[PDB]
Every structure is written in C-alpha cells, then in structure tokens.
Design a protein around this ligand. Structure first.
Ligand SMILES: *[C@@H]1O[C@H](CO)[C@@H](O[C@@H]2O[C@H](CO)[C@@H](O[C@@H]3O[C@H](CO)[C@@H](O)[C@H](O)[C@@H]3O)[C@H](O)[C@H]2NC(C)=O)[C@H](O)[C@H]1NC(C)=O
Ligand SMILES: *[C@@H]1O[C@H](CO)[C@@H](O)[C@H](O)[C@H]1NC(C)=O
Ligand SMILES: *[C@@H]1O[C@H](CO)[C@@H](O)[C@H](O)[C@H]1NC(C)=O
Ligand SMILES: *[C@@H]1O[C@H](CO)[C@@H](O)[C@H](O)[C@H]1NC(C)=O
Lengths: 100, 338, 338, 338
C-alpha cells in the first residue's frame, strides 16, 4: 500500500509578485498649491481639502475645499497588481472558487 | 567565498528517480527533474534535478557534477551538461540540486549530461512560454529599448529568502547486493550501511547488519535488498519513498530566489501622426503585436484597447475635453481639440 | 537470438542514392533517406535509410554500422548518429536499413552520423505530426493519466509480419576506373568484379571483362566504366537504376512493424459542477485543448461537440429525460432534474 | 585563384564588439553579429560577424578562422563553427566577415564557433522567415517539382558587385596595458602600436609612444588605456568608436551578391475535375496552402482567388465565353460549355 499526501503552499515567487485586494473608503484629499501673488512671487504649500485646516506658509494663510464632487475613480473593491490598479471585484476572503 | 554553503554541499548527497521519459522509455535516471519554475519574464528557467552538482567529493571543483550511479556516487566533469527545449538552451549557473538556465519557448524541457561512454538524458512534459514585460508582446530580448521592472530569478546563489527541507532519505532496494553463496542468497554491505532485510520465507526479519547470509529463501527475487543510507540526507522528493523513522533536519535555502530586477524591453516605432478637423488619425506600423489604449479626458472615458499586428490606420474623435493615447510602452501622450 | 536474422544481415549491401538535401545541395549520400513512415501515435518514427546499421562486415554486431564509401563498405563503430526534426530527436533502436526513433513535431527529418573527418548527413522534406491518442490534443506523453489502446511500432526486431523485396544491384557507374597508360585507356577490377567497357570511338561496344584494356579509343571523357558487384544484393529503391536481369528474390523482414500497444494518455482536470434549476453550469479549466462531447438521453439526441482550450463556463439544459457529458478522457456521467 | 582577393585578406583584421546576448548576458564577444540579411527565397541567410572567417594570417588555410582575443588575434581551425536558429542550421560557405548558411524558419539567430575549452557564441533577436517561390506556401524545398525564377545568394565569393567601406578602426581601450611600476600606473605597447594616453590628473596628454610610465595619477581606473592599431583595418561597424583623425578608404567586395537563380518549387496534387450543365465542379486535395485563382474570359473578368488549406470542393459557373483557372503553379487551363 502507498500513503500519498500533498498540500498547497504559496510559491516562492509570492514574495515579489502578488496581487493585493483592497477595500477603500472616501478618504481625504490633499493638494500642493503655488501662490505667486503680490510682490512675493512664490509659495510651496501642501494643503488639505477639509473646510477647517488653515495653511500659513510664508506670510499668507488660506483654507481650501471641500470639493464639490465626491467622485472617486476607485470602486469599493480594488485589486492592485504590482504597479497597475484594477477595480476587479475580488469575492471575499476564504471563498475563492478553484481556477478563478 | 563559495565555502559558506556546506549545508547544501556536505549534508546532501546525489539522488536518483523515475524520469518519465528517460531516453526511449521511463528508466530511473540520475538526473530526474522536478518542479521546473518557468514563471519569470526574461526567458530564464529554474530546474531542480535529482542529481546534485556543486563541489566535488570533499570541498573543491565547483565546475564538477556529482550524480549517483548504482550504490555509490561519482563526481566527474560537467563537460556536456545539456538543457533543451523546442530549441537548445544555454546554461547560466548551477548549485546543488538546482540549475538555472534560459530556454526558448517549447512544450518540453530536457536535461542531459555526459559521462563519456553514456548519454544519460532525461526530460518531462511542461509548457514553457515567456511574455516580455511591457505592452509589446515580443518573443526575444531585444538589443535596445526602455527598461521595466520585470520578474526574474536571481543570478546569484548566496541567498536565503526561501528554504527547502532535506530529511533522511528512505531505503532504496538493490538486488545486486544479493550475491550467491553456492546454494543460498548472501547480502553484502556498501560501507557498513544499514540493510533492512527479510524474504517471503521466514528468516532474519529486520536487517541492521554487516554482510549477512539467508538461511531460508534461495531465489534473490523474493528478498528485501534494502539500503538505509542516511549518512548524507536528501530532499523529500515525491519519487523517493519515506523513511519511517523521522524527518531529519537540514533545512536548505533555495539557491536561486526570484527577484524584481529590471529587464530591457522592446520599443515600437513611433507612429506617424496626421491631424484633421476634430479627429486624430494615427498612421502607424507595428513591428510586433502591440496594444494601444485610448482614454477620453471628459466625464465619459470611452476607453478602447486593441492589439494590432499588421500595419493599420486608425482614427479617433478628439473632443474639446481632449484625448490621450498610449502606443506600445512609449510614455503616454495627450492631445487637444482646436 | 540476434544472429537469427542472416537473410538481411549477410546478404544485404549498403547502397548509395541521391539525397535531395545532402548538406548544401543534392549529393549522392550513403545515408539517402527513403520511406519515412510517421504514421504512429505517440511520436515514434521509422526511417529506412540507405546505410546498413548494426552489422559489422564480420558476420554480425550491434555497436557498428556499415555504410558504403567508394566501391567498398567502410564499416565503423556507430558513435554520434543524429536523427533530427524541428528539435533533435532521440533514437530508440536501429536494424540494418531501418532506424526507429522518437521525434518532436516538425516538418523536416534529417539523419546523419559524423564519421569525424567528414559528416555525411542527409535530410528530406516530410511533415511529421503527432496526434496523441485520446480526446485531448496534447503534445508530449505525460507522466501520469489514463491509458488507451494506441498503435505504434515495436522496438522488437525479430518479427516477420511484412516483407520487402531485395534483388541484384544495377550497373553502378564509376568514372575512376577509366585510367590511361599514356597510349590507351586501362580498365581495372579490385577483386572478383566484372566491369563493362564502353567508348565513343568505333570499337567493341560491349567490353564485358575482368582486368583488361581498350582496343583503340584514348579519350577518358569519351568512355564509360560500369561496375558489376552481383555478389551482394540491395533494396529495391526508387533512386537506384534497375539491374537489366531478373528480380532476385529474398524477403527481408521489416524490423519494426506496427503493433497495438498501450500509451499513457493525459488526464484533464476535473470539472467543477454547479447545479442550477434544469441547468448544469459546468466550470472548466483545461490544460490543453480537449474535446467535450455531450448528448441528451431522451428521444432527440441533440448532440453537442466542441473543442475547448481557454478556460470557460458552459451551460446545458438538463431536462427530466436526462443528459450525458464526456469531459476529456474521463468516463461518461449522467444527471437528472426536479 | 582563391588568392586573388587580397584587398580583404591582408588589409583587414577582425575585431571585438558588443554582442546583444553573448552567452547569457551582454558581453563583448569576438563573434559579434551585424547585418543579418534574410532576404533570399530558399531560406538562405547571410550573416556579417565581426570575426574574420577565411584565410590564415597571410594567404592560406581556407579551413581556418581568425578572431581577436583581447589586444591580439590568434588564428585557429574552423573545427566546430555552427550557426543556429530555432533549429540548427547548415553552413554553406564562409569568407571574410560573412557567413552563408541555410537556416530553418525561426525568430532568433545565433552564431558560434568552439575554441575547444570555451564556446564563445553570440546571438541577436532577428526573425528569419521562409518565402516559397511561386504560389504554394510550403515550408522546405521539395525533392521534385517545377523550377521557378527565384532570387537567392550565390555560394561564389569572387565577385565585385558591391563594396563596403573599411576605414582605420577606432582605438580600443586595454586596461591590461595599465600595469603598476611599484607605485605609479605603467603602460606597455603591443608592437609599437600607438597608445593614446592621459589620466584625469595632469600628465602626458597625447601618447604616441613606446612603453611610458605615469608621473601624476595612481589608479588604473583613472587613465586612458588606448590602442590606435590601424596598421590593420576594420569594418565600418556601428559598435566601434570612430577615430576622429580621418576615415580611411579601402572598400572591399561583398562576398555573396544576390543573384537570380532557379530554385525547385513544389507542385500541388492535380485537381479531380467533375462537371454539370454550365458548371465546373472542382475537387481539391492540397497538402500545403496553395493559392487558387480563377478568371472568366468574358467581358466581365469577375476574378476570384482564395488560399485553400483544408481539402475542399468548389464550383464555378462556366459561361459560353469560357473560364480559366490556375491551381497551384500548374500551367493555367481553360474551358467552354454546352
Ligand atoms: C508658481 O506659479 C508661477 C506661475 O505659473 C510660476 O512662475 C513661473 O516660473 C518659471 C520658473 O519656475 C518661470 O520660467 C523660467 O524662468 C527662468 C528665469 O527667467 C528661465 O531661466 C527659465 O527658462 C523659465 O522661463 C516662468 O516665467 C514663471 N511664470 C510663468 C508665467 O510661467 C512659479 O515658478 C511657480 N512657483 C513654484 C515654486 O512652483
Ligand atoms: C479614418 O480616416 C481615413 C482618412 O483617409 C478614412 O479613409 C477612413 O475611412 C477613416 N476610418 C474610420 C474608421 O473612420
Ligand atoms: C449560460 O448561458 C448564457 C446564455 O447562452 C450565457 O450568456 C452564459 O455566459 C452562460 N454561463 C453562465 C455562467 O451564465
Ligand atoms: C457547389 O457549392 C456548394 C457550396 O455553395 C457546395 O456545398 C457543393 O458541394 C457544390 N456542388 C454543387 C452542387 O455544384
């Protein structure tokens, strides 16, 4: 009689190449603004979009946003493969069909 | 600095197994292959052969291979280590059980060395394909172009990213140990190695001995000519039966760990751009099948992906919002409308 | 035993014919290929070369080859005999005129040893296609899987299923025999030969003789030297001029006749069933292009047969009558509905 | 006769250049490949390697080759020169920098000799297709058939149809000239050749000398180690720097000029003709894809042509004006109807 056994273990290549499932929320947007007003002719400010945060780089202080459109190109489910982003609908954890 | 891998070099020994297509049939070649990892991009393949080439018997001769012939190992030259596919391949590096080589695409992979009086080849059926990294589905690494972050197996060997277990091997039969003592069967030992021994007739039931004789059975074909020879451990291959005692230590690092290097990819010839009134005509001639993508900058993307092989002329309605296109692996370019 | 084949071993002679692609152009190679028979299943090829393999001049052998250079059979050890296709093959066995080899798919077959100072190869245009036995259009015999009643050529040689003709050789020409003695042309015979003298000058036109000389003619380019070597016999090849006499008998048995053996066939991955109301959703993940056949069990067969290669999901309407589907080489199964 | 082309023989000397895929990586092989010319009909290829094949040092040894090993050349035999593609090719003639061979179809071309202790091969990504003469899309030259006016490279070399410029090569670096004079970097000379020389630090600024020493700099990786050696000229290769002094003349003839030869072409099996009222029925059983064309002889030509691969039966409405058809490369036939 022969007692043969086998189990599935993730490949060594998983350390470098591997897809990443991601569920995303609304989040908060940021911007880099340059203001060359008056005679100062310069700014280099990183700012938010929430309608409370002041930004007081150099001498002037200002507030930005919130955005008029809540448009997010990302879907609720997002799959990231190394460098490119795909809005593929990964099913859920621990439920993947074989072959798919 | 090649002497810092003696765990692979000394604790392991050459090994033999069922090659599915050894020559004209399924013999038991000393270079039976298993777990070919053809998942890189630059055409490189990692092959785990049963034979364990590396240093010589004690500590030297990196340029020598050591396979097992019969009861014993034999360290010889590596003169004609051949790896083949639909087209002949080219060796790159070898270490332990694993040999790193690059092959053209093909349906089968073959490995064969040369003892000198013997061929000793082995092959297996396994799909091999290599799509280059990028949008230009070429078929051979080009002379020039742009670089991209490909996936390729490391050229080096002194890495410990992953490990492979080497336990004690399981007993191998060899009926040539069963010499004849005029009218009875006489087992003899390799160096004092353990010989699990017993026949279908009632006689010595264990065998942990020097050279015994058999009192009861007479025909060698009904006797256990086994060798327990775990003085040098082996990899837990699927072609070798398991040692009932225990899985010994000997956790051995994978020689060639895949890493995210930067391969050189091809670049398609630049398209000939012709402008019309509120429409973009792309006069282009692809050398190899390349996909081009277009994406409107307005609210509605209206994307279009299309691999093209033959020279073709395409058109695009460039709206006031604007249009952008990516021909091949060239950097993306956008466009206006009046 | 091996020496129980004297009819082909003693009497046959290695002949030389007009290979179509002898190296650069069509020379007269001693290995002129004839009657390539790639009609088996698993990819085994029978080639009827013009050389006589196996037998040394000295009765019989197997580690030797007899090929004809010049007027004499310069027999040697067979040592580097190539059998090539789109990829190089691996020969199985050789017996006199015939050599059985296993090749990968390709469109050309080339044969050649390499006697060392010279190559002496030969090729011929003939497509070789290998359909594996079964429902799966595979490429190479896999390690495992089910077995099916294939048909192929036996490696055994001691068979007499079929015979081929072998009669007296024709009048081989040899210009090198027309030497001159500074006054008239001198004919020569090596040993036991009986050459024919013919010349353009008005003289004795018949000239059947042993060692002798011309009557009057002097211009070597105005003569013919035909050689007779009726001591041995050659195969009835279509590239060799017929002897003017009788069809000498002697049936050379064909060493490798087709037989009904058992080849290992591939085994497609099991489909993933998913039941649905009066509907059979079938998930398929083929490894190689495999036939899928289904038929209704009711009064109307409603057949459906379509090759599937890329993984896809197909659905069928399983009525209360029942449905049957045969995926790959798996045994057929049946289904109901509620 | 063969020594009547000394313009190339003595005046030119092979050099080293940057092979795209030398061995396993981008090394600087002495057999660097340039200008793969796959334009012949019968699959004949011309390759221009940077190594000079042909005569020995002065005028002899057609069976020898000359490559450049570091700063000096060493002519050896042609023992194991091999040009290879998807399948191994068959060399026809070698002369100067050029090799003529007949390769199977394939995507990559490789050239490689064998020095005996090392391979020293090179390869470049460059597809080579087969273009059968005529209308019959075969894959290898058949042994018979009707011949056609193909275009093919000639095996002859004593031709003067075309020339290629052979200027003084640019200078080459050799860091092995930069020995150490115990504490300073020190430059030798090959034979009195011109050693252009200077370092980052201020020292001897030209270098037109015998073996100099450095006064200023210390590191061998901070000096120009050059050799102006235009006592022997080199091809105008795009992989070597060009000496700014001047561009020498000395154009030598191209070995293998294309010629309008006559290749054998395949002949498709003849059609089985069948007929009905004003209606030709045509049975076709092609072995390889062959173009069929038809043409009505009336006022309206009404042409129709289609590549047919699978066996098929087609029809044609034959008017009393008559109909012509040209299956394969068989002479055109024509007909009337009732
Ligand atoms: C913030 O925004 C202003 C307005 O767009 C930016 O002004 C532009 O700055 C560039 C240099 O970054 C000027 O052009 C460059 O000027 C130099 C000096 O004359 C010249 O050598 C370069 O060839 C180049 O022309 C540009 O004239 C100026 N204005 C405009 C209308 O573009 C400013 O740079 C931004 N500040 C930051 C910190 O990003
Ligand atoms: C693209 O523009 C060319 C301009 O000559 C025109 O002939 C062709 O029909 C256009 N193609 C499409 C799909 O509109
Ligand atoms: C089932 O059949 C429908 C109709 O032919 C088809 O569109 C669909 O892809 C099939 N498979 C599944 C999983 O629904
Ligand atoms: C004529 O053409 C048809 C296809 O249009 C083909 O099926 C048939 O065999 C041919 N024979 C006749 C009826 O002329």
């Amino acid at each position: 009689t022969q007692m043969s056994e086998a189990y599935v273990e993730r490949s060594e290549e998983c350390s470098i190449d591997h897809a990443k499932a991601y569920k995303v929320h609304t989040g908060t947007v940021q911007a880099m603004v340059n203001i060359t007003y008056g005679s100062v002719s310069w700014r280099s400010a990183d700012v938010y979009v929430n309608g409370e945060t002041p930004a007081k780089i150099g001498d002037a202080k200002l507030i930005i946003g919130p955005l008029s459109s809540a448009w997010s190109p990302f879907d609720n489910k997002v799959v990231v493969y190394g460098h490119e982003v795909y809005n593929y609908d990964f099913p859920e954890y621990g439920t993947g069909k074989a072959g798919s | 600095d090649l002497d810092t891998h003696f765990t692979q070099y000394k604790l392991a020994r050459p090994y033999i197994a069922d090659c599915p297509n050894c020559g004209h049939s399924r013999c038991d070649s000393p270079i039976a292959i298993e777990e070919v990892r053809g998942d890189a991009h630059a055409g490189v393949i990692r092959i785990q052969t049963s034979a364990m080439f590396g240093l010589k018997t004690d500590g030297v001769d990196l340029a020598y291979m050591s396979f097992m012939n019969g009861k014993t190992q034999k360290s010889i030259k590596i003169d004609n280590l051949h790896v083949r596919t639909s087209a002949p391949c080219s060796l790159v590096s070898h270490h332990g059980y694993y040999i790193l080589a690059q092959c053209p695409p093909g349906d089968t992979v073959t490995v064969g060395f040369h003892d000198g009086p013997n061929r000793h080849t082995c092959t297996v059926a396994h799909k091999v394909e290599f799509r280059p990294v990028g949008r230009e589905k070429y078929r051979h690494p080009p002379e020039h172009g742009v670089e991209l972050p490909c996936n390729r197996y490391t050229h080096k060997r002194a890495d410990q990213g992953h490990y492979v277990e080497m336990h004690q091997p399981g007993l191998v039969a060899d009926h040539s140990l069963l010499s004849i003592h005029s009218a009875k069967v006489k087992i003899t030992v390799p160096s004092g190695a353990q010989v699990k021994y017993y026949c279908k007739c009632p006689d010595v039931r264990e065998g942990i001995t020097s050279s015994d004789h058999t009192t009861t059975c007479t025909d060698v074909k009904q006797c256990r000519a086994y060798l327990i020879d775990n003085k040098k451990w082996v990899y837990n291959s699927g072609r070798l039966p398991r040692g009932e005692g225990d899985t010994f230590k000997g956790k051995l690092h994978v020689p060639f760990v895949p890493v995210k290097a930067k391969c050189i990819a091809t670049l398609a010839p630049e398209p000939l751009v012709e402008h019309k009134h509120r429409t973009l005509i792309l006069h282009l001639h692809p050398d190899h099948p390349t996909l081009l993508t277009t994406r409107s900058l307005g609210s509605d993307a209206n994307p279009t992906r299309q691999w093209i092989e033959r020279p073709t002329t395409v058109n695009f309605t460039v709206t006031g919002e604007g249009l952008e296109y990516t021909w091949g692996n060239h950097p993306p370019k956008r466009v206006w409308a009046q």
